[PDB]
Enzyme design. Structure first.
Site, PDB file in Angstrom:
ATOM      1  N   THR I   1       0.868  -1.214   0.000  1.00  0.00           N
ATOM      2  CA  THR I   1       0.000   0.000   0.000  1.00  0.00           C
ATOM      3  C   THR I   1       0.888   1.242   0.000  1.00  0.00           C
ATOM      4  O   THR I   1       1.869   1.316   0.741  1.00  0.00           O
ATOM      5  CB  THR I   1      -0.942   0.009   1.211  1.00  0.00           C
TER       6      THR I   1
HETATM    7  B1  LIG Z   1      -1.972  -2.130   1.845  1.00  0.00           B
HETATM    8  O1  LIG Z   1      -1.020  -3.087   1.375  1.00  0.00           O
HETATM    9  O2  LIG Z   1      -1.657  -1.765   3.200  1.00  0.00           O
HETATM   10  C1  LIG Z   1      -3.398  -2.717   1.785  1.00  0.00           C
HETATM   11  C2  LIG Z   1      -4.346  -1.580   2.111  1.00  0.00           C
HETATM   12  C3  LIG Z   1      -5.750  -2.100   2.488  1.00  0.00           C
HETATM   13  C4  LIG Z   1      -6.435  -1.051   3.383  1.00  0.00           C
HETATM   14  C5  LIG Z   1      -6.605  -2.362   1.238  1.00  0.00           C
HETATM   15  N1  LIG Z   1      -3.496  -3.860   2.713  1.00  0.00           N
HETATM   16  C6  LIG Z   1      -3.546  -5.126   2.262  1.00  0.00           C
HETATM   17  O3  LIG Z   1      -3.586  -5.441   1.073  1.00  0.00           O
HETATM   18  C7  LIG Z   1      -3.646  -6.207   3.337  1.00  0.00           C
HETATM   19  C8  LIG Z   1      -2.381  -7.008   3.533  1.00  0.00           C
HETATM   20  C9  LIG Z   1      -1.322  -6.126   3.792  1.00  0.00           C
HETATM   21  C10 LIG Z   1      -0.329  -5.919   2.830  1.00  0.00           C
HETATM   22  C11 LIG Z   1       0.729  -5.049   3.088  1.00  0.00           C
HETATM   23  C12 LIG Z   1       0.803  -4.389   4.313  1.00  0.00           C
HETATM   24  C13 LIG Z   1      -0.181  -4.598   5.281  1.00  0.00           C
HETATM   25  C14 LIG Z   1      -1.240  -5.468   5.021  1.00  0.00           C
HETATM   26  N2  LIG Z   1      -4.622  -7.151   2.816  1.00  0.00           N
HETATM   27  C15 LIG Z   1      -5.805  -7.339   3.400  1.00  0.00           C
HETATM   28  O4  LIG Z   1      -6.183  -6.757   4.414  1.00  0.00           O
HETATM   29  C16 LIG Z   1      -6.622  -8.255   2.767  1.00  0.00           C
HETATM   30  C17 LIG Z   1      -6.114  -9.083   1.770  1.00  0.00           C
HETATM   31  N3  LIG Z   1      -6.937  -9.996   1.134  1.00  0.00           N
HETATM   32  C18 LIG Z   1      -8.259 -10.055   1.523  1.00  0.00           C
HETATM   33  C19 LIG Z   1      -8.757  -9.218   2.525  1.00  0.00           C
HETATM   34  N4  LIG Z   1      -7.903  -8.315   3.137  1.00  0.00           N
END
Ligand SMILES: *[B]([O])([O])[C]([C][C]([C])[C])[N]C(=O)[C]([C]C1=[C][C]=[C][C]=[C]1)[N]C(=O)C1=[C]N=[C][C]=N1
Ligand SMILES: *[B]([O])([O])[C]([C][C]([C])[C])[N]C(=O)[C]([C]C1=[C][C]=[C][C]=[C]1)[N]C(=O)C1=[C]N=[C][C]=N1
Ligand SMILES: *[B]([O])([O])[C]([C][C]([C])[C])[N]C(=O)[C]([C]C1=[C][C]=[C][C]=[C]1)[N]C(=O)C1=[C]N=[C][C]=N1
Ligand SMILES: *[B]([O])([O])[C]([C][C]([C])[C])[N]C(=O)[C]([C]C1=[C][C]=[C][C]=[C]1)[N]C(=O)C1=[C]N=[C][C]=N1
Ligand SMILES: [Cl-]
Ligand SMILES: [Cl-]
Ligand SMILES: [Mg+2]
Ligand SMILES: [Mg+2]
Ligand SMILES: [Mg+2]
Ligand SMILES: [Mg+2]
Ligand SMILES: [Mg+2]
Lengths: 195, 233, 204, 196, 212, 226, 222, 195, 196
Positions: I1
């Protein structure tokens, strides 16, 4: 295995060793002799991990018998006990140590004295008037501390030994199926067939 | 039970003849990342007390709000709120110390080390420490974290025991504090050049200095240092 | 489990005026079980005395090892080994087992036969030499012994006064340790006479 | 640690901070991380200080013996010797090394050898804990065939930011310039690079 | 710890050692391992010092309230069960107790209950409890009779603790003797093991293994 | 342990406290932590005491043989190289943390050495549990072009900071000065600011206070003639 | 994981005389290898001629002393200003400690004063409230160094009368307050030498029928 | 505790229970009665974790005695066994479950039939001609499978029980110090004082 | 993110990538991480998608109820409500939120709330896994009182680099502009921002 006891009286050493062999949930045998004659006037009883006990005892026996033939002479109990201690002290820092505790009862024909040595699997040697391995001492030493006298006859030693075995049979949870008793004196080694 | 996330490093302090001095840098670290560069970790309470806080910054901000609320509450139905019944350094400390020990006893600590510096009503210097375990102690010099290991030895050369306090002026004390902050900047990997310093004097009151910088640094000798042993070029 | 406190025991050494003293308890045990009250921990090679605490098998092994080495030393050198030289030999021998050490706390005591100077030294289990002027302590009641020695000791005690000091240091230290006691021996050592005294103490 | 090596028109320049840490304690604030394995083949070191010193000493020995038999080694050859040590002993080593050198035939060259012991020839390279914070800046600001003065400014500005954000980086910025003209050492102090 | 209690012709003998340890460190040699619940009831102390002290002192308060409410001496059965039911409520929490509750009533006669922190409650004639319990059992089992004189019974209890004091490293210090009759218990002194050992050895001819 | 090293005009000085500890107990109150590798190369050691001693004797022994082989006085860089390669090989298990200083035909030198085999160069260095207290003093008072007298003063003050503020350090200050074109001067117990006060009472016992069972003469002499 | 306990070092010593009692303690406060304070009082006057010290984890030590002082205050309120006797204080402290049996005050508590016959009294507690009246007790870091010395020099253990050779013990003659203070000072001087957590200063509180008096002595600061 | 056996013959139920109580290393007692009379014609033997066994047994006893007084009527063995099973089935999902196994031997006066129920600490109930808990069945079931006939007399049941105890005393490692034997029939509950 | 919020002359702009990952699988490549808690108070979300959605929904509810009683809330107030939820539930939450809003009295404001639940008012903020790679770039290129077009370029260039280096970031760059004029949504596709 379980209980091994030793007592040195006036003119002899008496070793008492349990007859039970237990593998887990069953008592496979109730007449096992946990001892080896190392020389005509030296006896060794033993207890510890399965297989290792007999393997160690027979290995010591073979070495002492070899010495006897080579020199046409019987080693003193003190000398035999020192040899055994060194083997165990060597063993404790090996890849797989001998998990064996022993009592060595011998009659020194030169000094005309009985001698009892207690040696554990680490190679910890002590000469004692009476000794034991495992939990045996926990029940028997208080009785021995009270009744023992250095001038006891062999018959008095056997009576004190019976009192020790009776206490064990009362307070020990495990059924060790009685003991085989052997006497070491100036005439050699003999087994008391009724105990 | 938690773990500290955004953290503040050393708080250092000492007594002198007419009052106390306290200092702390303006950094909020996020592990090895030097994330926030404008964090005030000295929080004044009235005109007689400064609370210096190290450790978790979210818990610091919570404590800051407790102190702000404490001032509000003390003023309630209190005609002498700005006089005889004003908050003392000793009152503020004991309150914090109670909270810290209660929180550790619930296995949910405020992950901080705190130094309360101030001057009492009778002019007496107040300097006492409290941390996440509820452990408290007082000394002519006090420091948290790395300051305990590096600042205290320097500050103790100025005031080694109680009888050295009346012999120590505000100029000598401030000089020692500023030097200690430079040493911490040389040697603490979670420190910054920018810091705040507060003096609480029984005569001149509370002097709060912001945007101070470590200066007069020795780096020139680095040019002669080559390799790690045998290298000549 | 901890090899240095399976068997128990203590040793203490002290210097006096033209004399040294070394003492030890007589207990050997298997944790809570007392096994022997005749396990002496002090040995001597010529005029050099060595006390050894810790794991009993290693106490015995090291004694046999140093007897071995000091006997060869004497045959080659044509003289008895001195305390200073023996101390270096103990250190060298322990350090050779750096990553598989003997679990022991040796203590050397003696008087140099040429200079007449009293000498004591202590070691950790891997050979670091502690050469104190006043006293050396070792074993499961070493904390207790430090406390006794630090208060009771004074320099330049006469042999018969030193005996009382070291004896009271041992006895009262042992009585505050579960794994020490069951008798005690004190060696008083002068340049050409050594007296050995067994002490009467509580047997619990 | 913040280290980098940058090729430019006249050759290559290595850059590094001077901080060595044991946890949060700065064990050395004036460290020299730019190390010489041959006259005009140097390296930047990151990771274990023991490991990277041991490796660099072995490499210097190998290249000294190479020179005595076959003459001056290429930068590629130096990078290969580093790689061989880093790859074959990957289980027991923690070393991230950037190798930079100047030939007359090949001019300035930069090779980066990350943890795994792989080799990557690049126009410029960045490494160490502090490098993470300047990937964006360096990618945006790097140009090929810069002048000496431009390359010094690029490294000075880059490592300034790496130092600013990374607690494991700090002290002075050391630089070593490798050209046909020779070997030049540069040093830049906090008062200079903090105001950039 | 070595504590014992046994029934005989003259009532009950209670004998305990005096040693308390923290690891190998001897913390105390003057511990009162017998608790005077009232003039008629005694409790022995083994395991955690505090747990035993606290809850057996508490037991005395419950016994007093019983006989205030019921105008009658509490039975040894009822007194022991109050303690066993209490520690059973705490089972799992980590209490550490091995106790003998000893008394003498009209309806019961001399009675001993072994009470335990795992909830065990056992009535019996002879009990030994503690690290040195095995050593004391040996002397008791071989010398115990019903037809013992109060004098001989007291000595046997003293001698059994001494046996354990000698051999068990976590037992020693001194011996406290009590004799429990129907009109109440009677204290029979503190006996230093350091003096008792040399005395018994000389007079009895025992411990020939030890040099004196 | 607090150990320091300080460069000056015409040489280098090292210093150390004299306390050794086993946990929270002081084993020796007057321990010697300044070790001689060669006549004009000395080092101070922190960490595992047997290791600092053993690694110094070994390298010092080999340095002596090297000096005899080459007909040259030993160099500090040689001691440094031999120490680091030995310590690296043992991957930090030999717990020796050393400050190595000395003078040789090349000049005066000051290095530090950690247990995993990494070395560092400097004008002032500190090692051990009291290194932070000492480094605070060094960072406050060090300057370029120190005299011999100023460097000894600075080094001992840095050790004192460790003595007073670090529980792992105490007792006395040992110093060794190595100046170019001179014999190295080892100043054992240079400062003694921790003498124990007189006790309130004498604990000398009356003779016959201890109970004895047996007495006997011990034969320390060899088997006799005739 | 959060560890609610810590170790602040220190050492304390209580000795009961014939008509007096002393409770001493060093003034050094530490964590790990650092000194927090060279003068942090550890032995407190709790009122009713009772002195107290709770050595170990200082936060628990302060909490306990604070709750006991409070208990003295409420004892006066609830029982018509009756003096809390030392034996009653001791039993009260047992309940304060045992109240936290399953999350203990990590301290070694000692109180000192005079019993209801005017004789010197010292009581000693473990962390979970077991207690016992004693003639002599050291607590804390250097307790193992000090206790054996006190067995020998206060109770004359292993000491016999010259000429008799072990037959007659050294008689247990009573010690004056000046004699006890000598033994306390030597105990702490010796403990300071061999224990790194002991030093800086020694503060002794002496209790008699006249009240509570204080004495301070310097200890080595290394 | 250790061994508890049960056998249902023609006109009675016989329960045999060991006398030993062992705390770790020592046998504290050799005359312990591991049973409680729930009603005049219902007996329950028990074995499991210390404290819990007696606490559970006496709790069940109190509940059945309460029922008997309230209704002036004895519950059938089947009804009592179902009550006990439910208490254990409730217990197994509690904060701290009762670690107790039981045999319930009863004579149903309505049906004029002996009945033996085996229930473990999970609340697993089975009606059986003969049963056991722990390792006891491991030795005895082969003998009982061979010799058992549903029309045995009480004397024949006791003889078959002696053969079971003899096998246990031969092959079991632990010394359980003999058994107390009790018979449940139309006349109530009685103890065999010589076994 | 990769998320950021930047104050400028006319107000504030929020920016974000559109990638949501489950390990290395991109579970959603067109995610909207710019979420509305009030008319002119928005936030950027990073960390757990469940946690930050749950929090944002609760905040929106709180501010809707605030508005019905006390009128339009300030950005500071919105940040405080976020903080209260993040701080008090720190043990059970994984949420890194940037709060951005436009008042007429206070103009553009940015508050960042990292993992611990602390609050920090800043001229601009960056967060998410990809932010690490642009600390250097953003610090060098940010100016106060930029124009709308300059701020869009600053965010576009910054998030471009964050996307380039961070595997957890990617897709489109979404932006939301908050000014007195109203609320404007912007979107920028890979073909546009990859060639920058
Ligand atoms: B980002 O990478 O922080 C992203 C933002 C979110 C608010 C859409 N988070 C995610 O993709 C998270 C995993 C993660 C990755 C990198 C850092 C922290 C967290 N994924 C999820 O929460 C997720 C993934 N698949 C299904 C449902 N939720
Ligand atoms: B740098 O941080 O990578 C730095 C470069 C080194 C070659 C001088 N490394 C260190 O400072 C390491 C620890 C470390 C920090 C950050 C990332 C990786 C490793 N320190 C040491 O190797 C070290 C520290 N103290 C003494 C000896 N060695
Ligand atoms: B005894 O050994 O059980 C003894 C009796 C106690 C009830 C006064 N217990 C202890 O000494 C225990 C340790 C222990 C040793 C052996 C077996 C079981 C337990 N000691 C303590 O409880 C203790 C130690 N130091 C201070 C306070 N309490
Ligand atoms: B110093 O604190 O580094 C000090 C100086 C030493 C090199 C002479 N070290 C010690 O005193 C070490 C501390 C230590 C304890 C335990 C493991 C490793 C290190 N002490 C010893 O090496 C030591 C302790 N007791 C006897 C002998 N040696
Ligand atoms: Cl390096
Ligand atoms: Cl989402
Ligand atoms: Mg043995
Ligand atoms: Mg003892
Ligand atoms: Mg930095
Ligand atoms: Mg004992
Ligand atoms: Mg000290």
């Amino acid at each position: 295995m379980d209980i091994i006891l030793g007592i040195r009286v006036q003119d002899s050493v008496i070793l008492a060793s349990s007859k039970a062999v237990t593998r887990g949930i069953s008592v496979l045998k109730d007449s096992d002799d946990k001892t080896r004659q190392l020389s005509p006037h030296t006896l060794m009883s033993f207890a510890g991990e399965a297989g290792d006990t007999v393997q160690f005892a027979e290995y010591i026996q073979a070495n002492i018998q070899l010495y006897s033939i080579r020199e046409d002479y019987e080693l003193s109990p003190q000398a035999v006990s020192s040899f055994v201690r060194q083997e165990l002290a060597k063993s404790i820092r090996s890849r797989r140590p001998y998990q064996v505790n022993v009592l060595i009862g011998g009659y020194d024909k030169k000094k005309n004295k009985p001698e009892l040595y207690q040696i554990d699997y680490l190679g910890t040697k002590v000469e004692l008037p009476y000794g034991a391995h495992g939990y045996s001492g926990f029940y028997t030493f208080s009785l021995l501390d009270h009744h023992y006298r250095p001038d006891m006859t062999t018959e008095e030693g056997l009576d004190l030994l019976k009192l020790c075995v009776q206490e064990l049979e009362k307070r020990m949870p495990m059924d060790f199926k009685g003991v085989i008793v052997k006497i070491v004196d100036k005439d050699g080694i003999r087994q008391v067939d009724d105990f | 039970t938690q773990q500290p996330i955004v953290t503040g490093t050393s708080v250092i302090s000492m007594k002198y003849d007419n009052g106390v001095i306290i200092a702390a840098d303006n950094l909020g670290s996020y592990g090895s990342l030097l994330r926030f560069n404008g964090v005030e970790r000295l929080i004044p309470v009235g005109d007689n007390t400064v609370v210096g806080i190290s450790g978790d910054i979210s818990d610091m901000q919570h404590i800051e709000r407790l102190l702000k609320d404490l001032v509000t509450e003390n003023a309630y139905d209190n005609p002498l709120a700005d006089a005889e019944e004003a908050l003392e350094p000793s009152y503020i400390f004991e309150y914090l110390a109670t909270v810290m020990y209660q929180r550790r006893s619930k296995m949910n600590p405020l992950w901080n080390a705190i130094i309360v510096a101030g001057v009492q009503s009778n002019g007496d210097q107040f300097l006492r420490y409290v941390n996440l375990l509820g452990v408290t102690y007082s000394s002519p010099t006090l420091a948290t974290g790395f300051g305990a290991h590096m600042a205290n030895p320097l500050l103790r050369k100025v005031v080694d025991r109680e009888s050295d306090i009346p012999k120590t002026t505000v100029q000598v004390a401030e000089e020692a504090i500023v030097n200690a902050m430079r040493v911490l900047y040389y040697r603490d990997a979670r420190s910054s050049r920018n810091f705040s310093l507060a003096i609480i004097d029984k005569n001149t009151g509370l002097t709060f200095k912001k945007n101070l910088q470590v200066e007069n640094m020795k780096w020139d000798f680095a040019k002669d240092i080559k390799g790690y042993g045998t290298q000549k070029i | 489990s901890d090899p240095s406190s399976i068997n128990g025991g203590i040793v203490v050494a002290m210097t006096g005026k033209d004399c040294v003293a070394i003492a030890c308890d007589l207990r050997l045990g298997s944790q809570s079980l007392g096994v022997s009250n005749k396990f002496e921990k002090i040995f001597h090679y010529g005029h050099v005395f060595l006390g050894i605490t810790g794991l009993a098998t290693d106490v015995t092994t090291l004694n046999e090892m140093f007897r071995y080495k000091t006997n060869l030393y004497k045959l080659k050198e044509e003289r008895a080994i001195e305390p200073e030289t023996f101390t270096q030999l103990v250190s060298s021998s322990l350090y050779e087992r750096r990553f598989g050490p003997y679990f022991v706390g040796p203590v050397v005591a003696g008087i140099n036969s040429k200079s007449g100077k009293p000498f004591i030294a202590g070691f950790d289990l891997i050979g670091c030499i502690d050469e104190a002027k006043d006293f050396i302590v070792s074993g499961t009641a070493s904390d207790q012994l430090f406390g006794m020695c630090e208060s009771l000791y004074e320099p330049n005690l006469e042999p018969e006064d030193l005996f009382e000091t070291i004896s009271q240091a041992l006895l009262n230290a042992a009585d505050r340790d579960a794994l020490s006691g069951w008798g005690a021996v004190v060696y008083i050592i002068k340049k050409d006479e050594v007296v050995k005294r067994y002490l009467k103490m509580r047997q619990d | 640690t913040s280290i980098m090596a940058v090729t430019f028109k006249d050759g290559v320049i290595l850059g590094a901070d001077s901080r060595t840490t044991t946890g949060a304690y700065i064990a050395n604030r004036v460290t020299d991380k730019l190390t010489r394995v041959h006259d005009k083949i140097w390296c930047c070191r990151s990771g274990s200080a023991a490991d990277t010193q041991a490796i660099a000493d072995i490499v210097q020995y190998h290249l000294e013996l190479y020179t005595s038999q076959y003459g001056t080694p290429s930068t590629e050859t130096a990078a290969s010797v580093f790689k061989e040590l880093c790859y074959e002993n990957k289980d027991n080593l923690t070393a991230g090394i950037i190798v930079a050198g100047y030939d007359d035939k090949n001019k300035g060259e930069v090779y980066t050898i990350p943890l795994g012991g792989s080799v990557h020839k690049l126009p410029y390279a960045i490494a160490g804990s502090g490098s993470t914070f300047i990937y964006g800046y360096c990618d945006k600001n790097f140009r090929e065939n810069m002048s000496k003065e431009e390359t010094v400014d690029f490294i000075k500005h880059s490592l300034s930011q790496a130092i600013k954000w990374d607690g494991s980086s700090g002290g002075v910025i050391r630089m070593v310039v490798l050209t046909a003209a020779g070997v030049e050492r540069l040093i830049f102090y906090p008062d200079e690079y903090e105001q950039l | 710890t070595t504590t014992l209690a046994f029934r005989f012709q003259g009532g009950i003998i209670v004998a305990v050692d005096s040693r308390a340890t923290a690891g190998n460190w001897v913390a105390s040699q003057t511990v009162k391992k017998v608790i005077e619940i009232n003039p008629f009831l005694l409790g022995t102390m083994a395991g955690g010092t505090a747990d035993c002290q606290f809850w057996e002192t508490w037991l005395g308060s419950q016994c007093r309230l019983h006989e205030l409410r019921e105008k009658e001496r509490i039975s040894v059965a009822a007194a022991s069960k109050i303690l066993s039911n209490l520690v059973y409520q705490y089972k799992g929490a980590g209490l550490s107790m091995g106790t003998m509750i000893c008394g003498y009533t009209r309806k019961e006669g001399p009675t001993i209950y072994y009470v335990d922190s795992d909830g065990t409650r056992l009535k019996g004639d002879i009990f030994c409890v503690g690290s040195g319990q095995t050593f004391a059992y040996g002397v008791l089992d071989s010398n115990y009779k019903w037809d013992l004189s109060v004098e001989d019974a007291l000595y046997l209890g003293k001698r059994s603790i001494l046996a354990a004091a000698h051999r068990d490293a976590y037992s020693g210090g001194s011996v406290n003797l009590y004799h429990v009759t129907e009109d109440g218990w009677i204290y029979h002194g503190n006996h230093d093991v350091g003096e008792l050992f040399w005395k018994v050895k000389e007079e009895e001819g025992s411990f020939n293994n030890v040099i004196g | 342990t607090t150990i320091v090293g300080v460069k000056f005009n015409n040489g280098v000085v090292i210093a150390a406290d004299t306390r050794s500890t086993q946990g929270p107990i002081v084993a020796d109150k007057n321990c010697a932590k300044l070790h001689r590798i060669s006549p004009k190369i000395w080092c101070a050691g922190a960490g595992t005491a047997a290791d600092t001693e053993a690694v110094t004797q070994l390298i010092g022994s080999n340095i002596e043989l090297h000096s005899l082989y080459t007909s040259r006085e030993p160099r500090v860089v040689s001691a440094l190289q031999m120490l680091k390669q030995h310590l690296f090989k043992y991957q930090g298990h030999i717990g020796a943390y050393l400050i190595v200083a000395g003078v040789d035909p090349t000049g005066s030198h000051l290095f530090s050495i950690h247990a995993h085999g990494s070395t560092d160069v400097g004008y002032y260095l500190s090692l051990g549990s009291g290194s932070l207290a000492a480094m605070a003093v060094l960072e406050s008072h060090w300057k370029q072009d120190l005299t011999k007298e100023e460097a000894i003063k600075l080094a001992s003050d840095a050790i004192q900071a460790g003595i007073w503020n670090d529980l792992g350090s105490g007792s006395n200050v040992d110093v060794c000065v190595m100046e170019i074109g001179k014999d190295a001067e080892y100043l054992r117990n240079y400062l003694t600011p921790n003498v124990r006060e007189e006790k309130q009472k004498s604990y000398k016992f009356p003779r016959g206070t201890t109970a004895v069972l047996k007495e006997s003469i011990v034969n320390i002499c060899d088997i006799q003639e005739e | 994981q959060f560890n609610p306990y810590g170790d602040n070092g220190g050492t304390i010593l209580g000795i009961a005389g014939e008509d007096f009692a002393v409770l001493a303690g060093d003034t050094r406060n530490i964590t790990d290898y650092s000194i927090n304070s060279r003068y942090e009082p550890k032995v407190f006057d709790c009122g009713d001629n009772i002195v107290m010290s709770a050595n170990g984890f200082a936060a628990d030590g302060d909490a306990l002393v604070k709750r006991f002082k409070n208990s003295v205050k409420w004892y006066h309120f609830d029982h018509n200003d009756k003096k809390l006797s030392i034996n009653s204080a001791a039993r009260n402290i047992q309940h304060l400690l045992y109240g936290k049996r399953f999350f203990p005050y990590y301290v070694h508590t000692i109180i000192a004063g005079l019993d209801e016959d005017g004789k010197g009294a010292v009581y000693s507690f473990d962390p979970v409230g077991s207690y016992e009246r004693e003639q002599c007790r050291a607590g804390g870091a250097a307790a193992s160094l000090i206790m054996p010395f006190l067995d020998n020099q206060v109770n004359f253990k292993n000491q016999y009368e010259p000429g008799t050779n072990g037959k007659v013990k050294k008689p247990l003659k009573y010690l004056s307050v000046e004699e006890v203070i000598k033994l306390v000072r030597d105990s702490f001087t010796s403990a300071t030498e061999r224990h790194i957590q002991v030093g800086d200063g020694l503060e002794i509180l002496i209790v008699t029928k006249d009240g509570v008096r204080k004495e301070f002595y310097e200890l080595k600061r290394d």
